[PDB]
Design a protein around this motif. Sequence first.
Motif, mmCIF file in Angstrom:
data_model
loop_
_atom_site.group_PDB
_atom_site.id
_atom_site.type_symbol
_atom_site.label_atom_id
_atom_site.label_comp_id
_atom_site.label_asym_id
_atom_site.label_seq_id
_atom_site.Cartn_x
_atom_site.Cartn_y
_atom_site.Cartn_z
ATOM 1 N N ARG F 175 0.825 -1.193 0.000
ATOM 2 C CA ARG F 175 0.000 0.000 0.000
ATOM 3 C C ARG F 175 0.871 1.260 0.000
ATOM 4 O O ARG F 175 0.352 2.365 0.123
ATOM 5 N N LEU F 177 4.312 2.624 -2.243
ATOM 6 C CA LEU F 177 5.366 2.444 -3.243
ATOM 7 C C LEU F 177 5.879 3.750 -3.844
ATOM 8 O O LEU F 177 5.133 4.723 -3.971
ATOM 9 N N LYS F 182 6.825 1.237 -8.564
ATOM 10 C CA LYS F 182 5.642 0.912 -9.353
ATOM 11 C C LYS F 182 6.067 0.461 -10.739
ATOM 12 O O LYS F 182 5.549 -0.511 -11.290
ATOM 13 N N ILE F 185 7.830 -3.136 -10.372
ATOM 14 C CA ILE F 185 6.826 -4.200 -10.213
ATOM 15 C C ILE F 185 6.195 -4.457 -11.579
ATOM 16 O O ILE F 185 6.109 -5.594 -12.051
ATOM 17 N N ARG F 186 5.804 -3.361 -12.214
ATOM 18 C CA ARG F 186 5.152 -3.358 -13.512
ATOM 19 C C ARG F 186 6.004 -3.998 -14.607
ATOM 20 O O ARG F 186 5.617 -5.007 -15.198
ATOM 21 N N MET F 195 -3.631 -3.542 -1.175
ATOM 22 C CA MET F 195 -4.763 -3.545 -0.247
ATOM 23 C C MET F 195 -6.080 -3.481 -1.010
ATOM 24 O O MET F 195 -7.092 -4.038 -0.574
ATOM 25 N N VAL F 198 -7.099 -6.900 -1.965
ATOM 26 C CA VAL F 198 -7.540 -7.647 -0.791
ATOM 27 C C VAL F 198 -8.967 -7.223 -0.450
ATOM 28 O O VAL F 198 -9.818 -8.057 -0.111
#
Lengths: 299, 299, 299, 299, 299, 299
Positions: F175, F177, F182, F185-186, F195, F198
């Motif tokens: 939650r 970054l 970003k 990860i991407r 989150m 989730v």
Amino acid sequence: MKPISIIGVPMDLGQTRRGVDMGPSAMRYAGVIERLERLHYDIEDLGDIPIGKAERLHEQGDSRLRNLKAVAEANEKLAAAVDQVVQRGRFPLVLGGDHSIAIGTLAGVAKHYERLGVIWYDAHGDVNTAETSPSGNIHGMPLAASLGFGHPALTQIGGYSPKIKPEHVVLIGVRSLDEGEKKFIREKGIKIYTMHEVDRLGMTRVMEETIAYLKERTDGVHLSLDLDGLDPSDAPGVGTPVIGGLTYRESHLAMEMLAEAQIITSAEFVEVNPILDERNKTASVAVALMGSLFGEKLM
Amino acid sequence: MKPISIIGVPMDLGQTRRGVDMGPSAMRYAGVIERLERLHYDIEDLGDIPIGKAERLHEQGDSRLRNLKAVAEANEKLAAAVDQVVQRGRFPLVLGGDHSIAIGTLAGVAKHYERLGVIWYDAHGDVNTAETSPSGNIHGMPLAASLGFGHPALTQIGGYSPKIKPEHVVLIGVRSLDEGEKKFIREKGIKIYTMHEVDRLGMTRVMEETIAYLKERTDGVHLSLDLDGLDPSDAPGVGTPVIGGLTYRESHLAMEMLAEAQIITSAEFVEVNPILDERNKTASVAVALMGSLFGEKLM
Amino acid sequence: MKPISIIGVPMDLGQTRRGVDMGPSAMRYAGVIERLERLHYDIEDLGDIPIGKAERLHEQGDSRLRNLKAVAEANEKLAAAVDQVVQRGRFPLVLGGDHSIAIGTLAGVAKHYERLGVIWYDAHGDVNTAETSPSGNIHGMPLAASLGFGHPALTQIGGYSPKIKPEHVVLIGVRSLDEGEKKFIREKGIKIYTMHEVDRLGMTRVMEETIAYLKERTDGVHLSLDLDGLDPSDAPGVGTPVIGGLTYRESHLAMEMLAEAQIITSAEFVEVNPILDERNKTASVAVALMGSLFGEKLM
Amino acid sequence: MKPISIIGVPMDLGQTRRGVDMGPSAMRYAGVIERLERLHYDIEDLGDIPIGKAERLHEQGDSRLRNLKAVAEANEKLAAAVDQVVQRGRFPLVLGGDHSIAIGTLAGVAKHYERLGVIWYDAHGDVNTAETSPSGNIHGMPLAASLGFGHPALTQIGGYSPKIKPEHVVLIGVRSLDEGEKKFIREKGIKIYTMHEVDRLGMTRVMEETIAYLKERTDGVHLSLDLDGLDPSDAPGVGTPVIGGLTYRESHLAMEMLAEAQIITSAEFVEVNPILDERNKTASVAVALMGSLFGEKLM
Amino acid sequence: MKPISIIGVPMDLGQTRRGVDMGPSAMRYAGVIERLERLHYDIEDLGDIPIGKAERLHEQGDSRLRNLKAVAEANEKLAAAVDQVVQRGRFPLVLGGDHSIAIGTLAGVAKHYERLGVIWYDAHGDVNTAETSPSGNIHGMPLAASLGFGHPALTQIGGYSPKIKPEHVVLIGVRSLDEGEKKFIREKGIKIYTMHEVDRLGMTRVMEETIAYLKERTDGVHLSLDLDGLDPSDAPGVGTPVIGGLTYRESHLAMEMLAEAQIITSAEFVEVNPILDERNKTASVAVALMGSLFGEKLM
Amino acid sequence: MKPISIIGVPMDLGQTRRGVDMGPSAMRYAGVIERLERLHYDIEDLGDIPIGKAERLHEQGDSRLRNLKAVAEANEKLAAAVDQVVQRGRFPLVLGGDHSIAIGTLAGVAKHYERLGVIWYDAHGDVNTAETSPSGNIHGMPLAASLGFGHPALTQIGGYSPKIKPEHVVLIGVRSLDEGEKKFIREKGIKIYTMHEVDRLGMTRVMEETIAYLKERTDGVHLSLDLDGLDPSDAPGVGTPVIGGLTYRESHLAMEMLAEAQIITSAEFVEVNPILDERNKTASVAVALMGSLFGEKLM
Ligand SMILES: [Mn+2]
Ligand SMILES: [Mn+2]
Ligand SMILES: [Mn+2]
Ligand SMILES: [Mn+2]
Ligand SMILES: [Mn+2]
Ligand SMILES: [Mn+2]
Ligand SMILES: [Mn+2]
Ligand SMILES: [Mn+2]
Ligand SMILES: [Mn+2]
Ligand SMILES: [Mn+2]
Ligand SMILES: [Mn+2]
Ligand SMILES: [Mn+2]
């Protein structure tokens, strides 16, 4: 996984025929053997149980129980056949006509379990007795008889009774009952998910509840699936079609869930009627359902 | 429970026939009377309202209003008949062809209630006026006319207008509207559950919301059910079939919920068309739905 | 909104014909042009891509790739045509037979996007390669080929590869896969909603998840809709019908959601087969879906 | 995106103070300006609306409307300020104490829209009138007054009424209502998601339904967020804390969804009370929520 | 509705005190009487059951059953008092300290029902026996004893045993059990929803299942609510706090559902401990829950 | 089951201390050893890895990599220690301060697996590099470094790189970054459940998806749990608390699911900070989670 033994029971012994005796042949035509072999099962087809002829224009028999002798005799042989299959450590898969054969299937299976549970997937409850049946058709009495309530000739098949307790039965898809049946379900306290409950809860929840319920109280579970549990739009070829039934998608999901659950120890797919079917559609639906029951996964 | 009086209105008065005039006959054939008698109702069949013939190719008329005279006159007689049934403390059950008869049914009923509500179960909104109708067919204008919007010959039937207020109408199953109808529904603030909403919410929620809404603001509720609200797969024999409709299961559930709710004080099942039906299937579906509406329970 | 350009590709080049070459004609007959014009679109029909004849049993070719030359050449032309449509700032709408044409459509489109996503609505995964295909039919390989996995003749169409990344593809309605395809989907990590997931989650959730997923990671989205994704009861006229599919209602909802989302930048409706269709029903269904995709609202 | 103009209204005018007047200061302390600047917004802080002192004891007034003059005058000024912000093509973000300021915010905003919708996120309905209010506190009447119900002093602010229609209001998080408020919500037909509905449906569904509903019927949407809509565990510092509220996660999700939806055209975060807060926690929560509302994404 | 009679049992008789004896006083301070009166109930507070002092060390004590005499004697009086309340046709609402008092409450209630059911809302199972209890605290044995498993001194209270059958008990919120308790629950087949099931199923489903289960097999249901069933964040003041419990929202929802169901015929809220509470928060939580159980609705 | 070896790494080497060095001591105080022994494990506590002091100002140190030498040296020793534990056929359980120690834990573990997967439970992604880190704190780079991205000093620890592949990592609870994170990860295609996911999917689904994904592609799975993945309300004592996190219930469920799955082959619980904790609450939460991970069942 254990081997499977298919047993066909071409019975169509209600007062008047419904064409369901051809069910086993149609499902074989639809490829039940081949479907299961692909799943890598050691499977055999024991053939068919011999069925006596129905009552002629004038024969001996009980008014309140159509073709009692032939029905009882056929079920007695089936019970023996099923018993042996279980003895051999194989999974009995009975294909049929009349749902009356559940008497024979449960007779051969139950004795091998302390608390055998049953999932009765059907449009009807099948809990009539000679006393409550408007027709006298034994195909409308198999569940009651197996619970120990019916004509002595039916309740004692296999040499014992009852085969199961009411607390271990779960009815699913029911949408057609006689008043006496309603009373029976009610007084015996049989768990039942009518189409109303499926509509309000959804099949996923219905199945989760069913699976959990039986799992927490039985040591084996028998699936007695009557194709008329599905809506006639998906399963047109059945003995006694009733509108407003389960979709093929709900049934397919149900079979996948049971498979995942690993609770089914015996099963039977009955009431397929080629006379009302469209290009063996219903028989093919039965086979696809068996495929899911036995492990076929979409991914 | 109060007695029921069936009134048939064999009207097929659009510009061109659609076969819906045979609807009442088909539903009678499907056993509506017998179905209701088994539920223990004191029910009578008053017969049919006489319908004038249709206008031909180039007769004098109103092209914005096909067969205005015959439609209006038939509705005027129906309004009278319905009024008397209500006077007698009986439940009016109108069977029909054109949904145009809703004008007559509402004319006879509404005057007996302070705040009459309406559940319009249909694939179409039926809120066109002579100005907005592409066809001029009055069967596409019954709801609007009953709300007081439209041409005078229709809005004044029964000697008054409007019969109902927009805040007391709930449309269900709508999936086919003219731009003017979208504007109408929108501007008049009529509550509507299009197929989109049923898909996203589910029929159980749609019905709970509907029942509560009307219950908290009306003193009587009229059910105007057009069989085309159901999908043509379940109800093939309708005047104007539209794909993507409600299933028989959703409709059956809806009727059971309304029955439980006890809010329906008058009802009409319309638009059954034998010409596009398969072995009186749709007529039988109408009767099963009526059965549920009147208390038939699956357990 | 930008203009639309329809391109038809009457391809039926599997080992044996399936009748899908007639798909474009059937959809034009069902009124795709008129449907879109009513929505106020500037739309043109560029016509059909020429398709070479199929190979005969004992002719030189590629058993692992049925009709490779004709398939590759037709896709090369389509790629060029689609590329030009995009160049002109128009929305390419490809109508077809074999889903193999997806190779051509994606070849012309992809090069115009940084991260082109794909929603593959189909009963099958279409991720076979010459190595994994039991049949050698290229119509069962379009997705894999577009992802860069497969024979060079297909993967290089348009002068580049891959056209898309696995993380930008979402399969929906899948219910029929070869073991190799299951391995492919699995190893490549392609997002997939089999019929099982649709059953458990419901189409609204499936579509919300799909739209959000692609929206957060692509700059254009291509819809490759195979009519066999729908259940044969709704779409009987398809090349390879598979029972247990999506309903017209779920599909109609899906199209409306995509429309609302505004994420679709190119689309293709394929595999319509007039030979198994009932009165152009499936072609009509295709057009209604296109209508929803392009803005048609029920209210 | 358009610029933002923050306006603070330090009003704490109920019969007895609740400390909410310090709300704007606390939220500025929590970094609302900096938070929005980082998102690259052109934002200005116009400062605070001057608030008159409250009536003590020996002051001529009314119990039915505590501090009516000061409340009305402050709201009149706020309405003017908000109006101008909108005139300048800027997004008005009002920070406050009493939720009574919604009267002023809506007065300045509404006149610029044909059908302005409202999402009222609060533990209370705020639909009391001088007649129904047990306390006479205007902070319990802002929604009703804005709908055109209540003392003219409040309903006429801005020179018009009503500012909005009941069909364009959606209440969320409500868990505390007076009987008259229940009657009001009920009779006016205001859409409401009580904590019960959030529990049964989940916030994602609640928000999707809300966004769709308003989107399909309004040309602008105002968000009136009362921090007490969140549970006191997440937002301890509020004027009137009520147990059983929305979590920070649900609220954060809601804000992200509204942002995605792009429907919010004006907003206000009110009722922050430093006296019951823990280290400016609630103020910090308000700012994080504003951050999400304005585009802050977790990835 | 029938009148309510409150009975307080200030018992804190484990080996060492936990402060729960002050529970009744705290709940009275939180306004239980006033809360119920507002709901229009005819309610009386009978006062408190006298409790004997606890063993110190050099006395006739039992390490397997701490304070057996005092605990038994207090429960015997409570049983009598409860019995009389039921005799008078009033609803017994017992407030307490130790959950041991459930022995007394059930002793007075059960005898008035054929099949009394029990919903045991607690962090613990309370099914220990003198043999299985690590501590010898009777507050960890009330359910077992009531089922007829425990020291004669406890199992025979009220002059009979057992008070209830295992099939009529449903445990909710359990998250802390001794191995012997796990064995007991397991072997006796007591229905139990641990925090794990609540997490996976959600409280709405847990309550629907529970309500249906008991409703279909009992003629009265007793609610034995231990405040420690809630998470210490919501209910800090309890005798034996255990992390990972039910939220106030889930509990509030549960009470509302039970109220709607109309199945609760007697109830008790126990284990409130002022020593670990924050400003009577837990006592206030108990009262709000009672309010919901007795009809308080948020709209 | 195999024996467990606990290794503590009291590292607090960011630019400025956060108190997490005391984490191992706090978790030992909370009873980690005793908790595991009760589950019948053969467990040893190897003690702590020695940590070098940190640079101040007038000392050698890279601003882009705070305390690089000490951090690297400590991780090198840890890698050796962990390696040996695995060699001995024991399960390595590392307790820590900085999440930087994940570099050392993965260095010692990974070399023993063909395809080691990782579940990174954290509020942050930890995928910064010297280039992207705003702070230069290595505790914000452990995942990237382990993936082979970062200073050779970190990427080469243990004498190899990378330790894992991006396709085998699943981030959960993220939650917070940096933009570069970003992008990382991407671009690397790392599976991540923020989150948001989730909230929309629910922890049960998140865990099922995660477990299945990794299970179908790895031969061992390492759990790297940062206590800040939980919300500060449940885990106040962490190095860098971030609001809006996972509840203790979701985390407890997750651990139970992983246990059932049997996929975790090594684990580490890090970032416990006694300075912000409340009576060792967070340390106790860590131990309860470890208890679940290792088999502790609530029934
Ligand atoms: Mn049967
Ligand atoms: Mn049947
Ligand atoms: Mn109509
Ligand atoms: Mn119609
Ligand atoms: Mn395809
Ligand atoms: Mn296909
Ligand atoms: Mn408010
Ligand atoms: Mn409030
Ligand atoms: Mn207890
Ligand atoms: Mn307890
Ligand atoms: Mn970390
Ligand atoms: Mn962290």
